[PDB]
Amino acid sequence: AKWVCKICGYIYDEDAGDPDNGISPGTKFEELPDDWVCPICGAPKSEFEKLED
Ligand SMILES: [Fe+3]
């Protein structure tokens, strides 16, 4: 699934993970660390919204 950072527009794609920041591919948004932030603007996880209907 994909989740968008409502602050900058970054898209956390579970399939891609965030390797740069210690998150391998396939890591579900809910399994990210409570301390994980957007790699682009630093917004907390709370500012992400899943892309679903
Ligand atoms: Fe962001």
Q: Tell whether 8 is in a known binding site.
A: yes
Q: Tell whether 25 is in a known binding site.
A: no
What's the 10 CA to ligand 1 centre distance in angstroms?
5
Q: Tell whether 7 is in a known binding site.
A: no
Q: Tell whether 41 is in a known binding site.
A: yes
The secondary structure of 1-53 as a DSSP string is -EEEETTT--EEETTT-BGGGTB-TT--GGGS-TT---TTT---GGGEEE---
Domains and CATH numbers, the chain: 1-53 (2.20.28.10)
- Give the rounded distance of the alpha carbon of 6 from its chain centre: 11
Residues 11, 30: contact at Cβ < 8 Å? no
